[PDB]
Write a protein that binds this ligand. Structure first.
Ligand code: NA
Ligand code: NA
Ligand code: NA
Ligand code: NA
Ligand code: NA
Ligand code: NA
Ligand code: NA
Ligand code: NA
Ligand code: NA
Lengths: 173, 173, 173, 173, 173, 173
């Protein structure tokens, strides 16, 4: 049953990629939830909605790239349930940005664990794949979210609704 | 807690839209599974892979349009777990097309039930939304899948691997 | 023998579509007859001829769209004889426009009966198909013919041959 | 005295269309009043003025489309007095947006009553006309106004004149 | 309560402008009525319909320009009911043109009274506004309508329906 | 009652043209039937469907050209019922091509009989009309159909569904 393409690809690596696929699809779904929260008539921050929807689509592309890697290496994709996000109501633009920062750090920690596994199993193709396609993207996403959280807090969010309004217009618009 | 926009939108309709959102996201995930099955080195039908991946992205767009409708009407989106697809291994191009036809008929039956509810609750905006955006799209998808199943069976799939190869090239390419 | 695509499509609906196909092909043939009446050397109203020939081609397109619908829904097309039109000699431009108005109202009444059947059989795809593609087209055709009949009568048709001549040039040209 | 074009068009439907024409012309006139309130030297919110003037012109187009429908179906237009709006002085951008939301919900309720009448009189052309041209336009207008009301309230209108100023510039500009 | 912009603008002038706004909106509504009379299936003179609809839109622009003037001068707009037109059925193209000529002379007489008031109150800005934007427009409209009435009478309207038909095509088309 | 244009046009020729008009309209209707057979979900050969639909439209153009000839010569068009085609179900691409070849030979035999009549009645305009517009078109159609029948039989139709599939793609596509 070994794939004719499989070479230097450990079962532990294959299993870790399947876990990462699920985590990327989960992240996609959290961002989708946040997007449509900001589209509510009683929230009405269109640029927050657009920002999170773009993040949702990016996470789905990240999941699909891992699925392509699994097939390239001769692993087998096993999909799992995509859990519902932890909240239905994300409270404010600042609370959503803080939850996004927490989610991106969690994804990053998973990627760092996968890199460590690839290095331990002497799988340099997999380690390079993670470095090239995932680790700098996560560092940039974390820095961007931290920048957004800083600005919203300085402007007086979430107490001032003027803060979120102007951030929506000037930063996310 | 009633939305300032809400007018002539029954709680039963709101709940049915939340169910339909989950079913569209489920369909998306089934198509994603089928896509990456055809990308396996031991299957290697790139045009089947492309066809199912396009279907996956379309189902996600259909889910997002329902989420937009829920907010437009002043309903509240409640997301649920997205169940994993029923198979990991889709066996053949003909078996996948037959499973897709079965899935599209199941989605269609759900949409017909939603239309009936909208009509019973005297919600003509919702009934028109379903007619305009969903029902003809489902009829066309069903007819296209039935056409694909017919051609693959006539060509001698799944017994002849030449059949799937040539269908991949000439119909899906 | 049930089509693999067939879903929520009643035998009564299938039979009514076959009847409507025949009525559209009949209408096409009536308009063709009227067109070539106006092309006679002893009638010689080229713009009346062009108007009716365009109507003939439109009715054929309407018949073909119903045939496409029958196949999309998994019904089976059964064609019948196309009866000859009721007249060989249409007498005048005003008499032909009045016969066209009567024919378009007859087609409209058939379409309204089909819509009522679709609604009674809880077939919203079929009801929407009729609404979208047929009912507004028939209302516009009826209003246009009524406008033509009004103008020809006011101008003094069919007694004044100058009336039909000038209507041919200024309205239909 | 029956119009030569009239078919399946109930007197009750004809009367309801005449009422809807009056309500659309009334709405037009309310929006015109609001527009020129914001053009006052002691109010001076040019983008609010532009927004309401565009709404005024759209309502007039909606009235004219109903007048065209009445003639298409062979009904007879009976115009009534256009009542003056309920206010001369609209107080603030937030109060005007709230009055607009209330007016759009009132128009929507009238349209839903007309749709119900069309359905009860088995007039599918009229029901489809309302669905296609009016109901989704009203849902979008209501959602947009609710979004505007939400943002103005969050920003601190009408107490902060800075709120209305910045909303005028960033949302309506 | 005096506007910070108000200078040399008499209360009598302000009241006369409010009356003129109502008369322009009334004229708009009369022309709208006439337009849709000519769109009836039993009248069917499309170019008469287009001519009156353009006149309706022009009168609305004239009303809006007076509303802008009232605000420019620091007056306050008070809107009144827009009375329904005197007829539902305008009888013929010649009768409608004669009623339009009578309406335009009535508007002109009101404008001449406003000019006389502006001159009596030593308000040269208002007198110049009326001269520049209204008086030559009214003289041209009156002359054009008189020309139309003359031609229709000479051609044999309203007895000859051929006259109105050819006038519709050649003058108004 | 003789047409002012009629010259050297025998009653027998006029009657034969009326028969040929009916036969061309019949052929059109047979091709339309075959087209929509190939559009069925359980047949699904789109290029066969397109081929027959083009043939249907060409036969209608041939009928209209005969109607134009009848009027040019001062004959009178008498239309008859268009009989329904001999089959509802055309069985296979090879069986339909064989039925088309048989139909085109039948049309050709009728045209040869009309040419013989024109020659016997010393009507060189009519004989030239048939030669120029019909006889070479029929020879080319017959040769093309014979070529299609030969290729489908050689490829192993109708037993191999792969044959019809590949013919549909490579010859008719
Ligand atoms: Na990611
Ligand atoms: Na590296
Ligand atoms: Na879908
Ligand atoms: Na509809
Ligand atoms: Na039709
Ligand atoms: Na409206
Ligand atoms: Na004026
Ligand atoms: Na032919
Ligand atoms: Na020759």
């Amino acid at each position: 049953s070994t794939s004719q393409v499989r070479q230097n690809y450990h079962q532990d690596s294959e299993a870790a990629i399947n876990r990462q696929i699920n985590l990327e699809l989960y992240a996609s779904y959290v961002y989708l939830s946040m997007s449509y929260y900001f589209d509510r008539d009683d929230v009405a921050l269109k640029n927050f909605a657009k920002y999170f929807l773009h993040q949702s689509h990016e996470e789905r592309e990240h999941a699909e790239k891992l699925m392509k890697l699994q097939n390239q290496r001769g692993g087998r994709i096993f999909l799992q349930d995509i859990q519902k996000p932890d909240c239905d109501d994300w409270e404010s633009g600042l609370n959503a940005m803080e939850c996004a920062l927490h989610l991106e750090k969690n994804v990053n920690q998973s990627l760092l664990e996968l890199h460590k596994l690839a290095t331990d199993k002497n799988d340099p193709h997999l380690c390079d794949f993670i470095e090239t396609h995932y680790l700098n993207e996560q560092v940039k996403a974390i820095k961007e979210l931290g920048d957004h959280v800083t600005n919203l807090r300085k402007m007086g969010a979430p107490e001032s609704g003027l803060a979120e309004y102007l951030f929506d217009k000037h930063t996310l618009g």
